[PDB]
Amino acid sequence: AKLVCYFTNWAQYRQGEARFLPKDLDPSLCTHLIYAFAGMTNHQLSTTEWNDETLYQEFNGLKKMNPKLKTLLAIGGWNFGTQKFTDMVATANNRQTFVNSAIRFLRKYSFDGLDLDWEYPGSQGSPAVDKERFTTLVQDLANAFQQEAQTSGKERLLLSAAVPAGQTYVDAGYEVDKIAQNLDFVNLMAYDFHGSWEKVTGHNSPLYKRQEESGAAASLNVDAAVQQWLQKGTPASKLILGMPTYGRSFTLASSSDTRVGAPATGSGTPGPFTKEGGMLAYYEVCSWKGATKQRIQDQKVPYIFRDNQWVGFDDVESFKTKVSYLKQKGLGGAMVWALDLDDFAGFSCNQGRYPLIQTLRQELS
Numbered sequence: 001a002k003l004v005c006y007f008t009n010w011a012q013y014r015q016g017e018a019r020f021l022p023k024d025l026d027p028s029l030c031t032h033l034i035y036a037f038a039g040m041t042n043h044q045l046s047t048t049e050w051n052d053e054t055l056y057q058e059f060n061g062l063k064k065m066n067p068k069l070k071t072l073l074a075i076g077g078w079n080f081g082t083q084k085f086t087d088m089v090a091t092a093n094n095r096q097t098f099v100n101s102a103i104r105f106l107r108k109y110s111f112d113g114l115d116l117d118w119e120y121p122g123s124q125g126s127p128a129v130d131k132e133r134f135t136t137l138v139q140d141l142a143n144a145f146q147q148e149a150q151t152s153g154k155e156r157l158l159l160s161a162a163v164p165a166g167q168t169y170v171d172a173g174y175e176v177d178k179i180a181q182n183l184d185f186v187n188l189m190a191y192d193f194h195g196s197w198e199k200v201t202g203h204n205s206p207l208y209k210r211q212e213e214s215g216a217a218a219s220l221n222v223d224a225a226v227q228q229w230l231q232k233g234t235p236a237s238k239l240i241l242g243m244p245t246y247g248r249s250f251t252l253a254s255s256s257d258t259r260v261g262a263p264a265t266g267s268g269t270p271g272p273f274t275k276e277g278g279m280l281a282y283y284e285v286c287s288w289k290g291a292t293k294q295r296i297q298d299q300k301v302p303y304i305f306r307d308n309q310w311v312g313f314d315d316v317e318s319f320k321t322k323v324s325y326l327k328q329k330g331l332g333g334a335m336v337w338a339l340d341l342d343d344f345a346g347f348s349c350n351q352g353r354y355p356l357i358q359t360l361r362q363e364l365s
């Protein structure tokens with residue numbers, strides 16, 4: 001099976017021990033390492049950090065310690081927006097500029113493939129035509145990669161994309177049917193289903209729906225998302241179940257009511273290391289003294305709370321489960337976001353190195 005794990009640029013800036021660099025990457029923990037992120041400048045693939053070139057060298061260097069390992073460069077993300085994307089795909093001449101810069105950029109730093117993270121084709125201010133163009137981008141990259149390998153005699157570069165679990169976004173700009181055939185594999189980011197952007201407490205990545213929960217909110221869970229993509233026409237072998245190594249927090253209305261789906265005034269206060277409201281890294285979560293861990297029967301997932309803070313995350317057991325669901329449905333493997341967010345150096349969870357992801361590696365084989 002495949003174990004796809006994301007590495008992020010900005011992790012290098014975390015203070016204290018939370019600092020993450022390639023040096024902290026275990027070359028054997030995952031089957032595929034993905035670098036987040038790479039930008040675009042003049043329809044061309046280009047770095048985004050002052051020391052990306054040195055990092056690209058380290059990241060891909062791991063392959064000397066494990067030749068079986070595969071690395072891919074990811075372009076986009078949430079903050080990337082859609083402007084630069086929609087532009088690049090509008091005209092075949094700018095599109096071809098990209099396809100070519102891709103092939104050169106990747107071959108220059110030793111990347112085995114490229115991960116497309118357009119969020120999202122035909123959404124967030126993206127013409128409903130981009131849905132079609134995205135397919136064209138996928139097909140173009142696909143052909144170029146197929147051609148290049150034949151004339152260069154090197155291992156064909158890989159092409160994957162990070163797709164959404166959001167019913168809307170899905171039907172909004174993804175020709176599942178078609179793209180699924182030009183992508184080596186599909187990373188379903190089955191997380192962020194619920195968040196501080198809802199005035200009522202919810203869980204980040206829920207496996208199934210709550211017994212007392214329906215309507216459109218019945219789609220907001222892993223299973224639903226997973227069954228969706230499979231039906232739309234994605235062979236399961238090419239479907240990678242993404243899993244979060246972070247959780248989502250809410251500042252409760254009153255420490256009196258902590259019912260999953262309780263009134264929340266807003267996002268949980270920010271963590272000491274990640275420093276972002278409504279978001280907590282696993283290693284920060286398990287740092288809660290006198291917390292109150294709990295589980296959601298319906299949707300096999302925990303969540304702790306202390307006073308007015310309520311954070312829904314995944315722990316070792318919730319990962320064991322999901323890996324199990326994964327296998328059950330016959331999926332191609334698991335995908336994890338993100339490396340730097342697990343307790344990568346066992347400095348606060350008291351569970352060793354990469355607690356969450358190691359559980360994945362174990363169960364997967």
Ligand SMILES: CC(=O)N[C@@H]1[C@@H](O)[C@H](O[C@@H]2O[C@H](CO)[C@@H](O)[C@H](O)[C@H]2NC(C)=O)[C@@H](CO)O[C@H]1O
Nearest residue numbers: 077078079080117162189192246276279337338
């Ligand atoms: C492929 C993927 O997971 N894409 C999304 C991620 O980019 C996103 O991570 C968030 O990225 C922002 C910049 O792109 C960061 O500022 C932000 O801190 C970071 N948040 C987290 C929790 O890593 C994740 C998270 O929601 O969602 C993906 O859809």
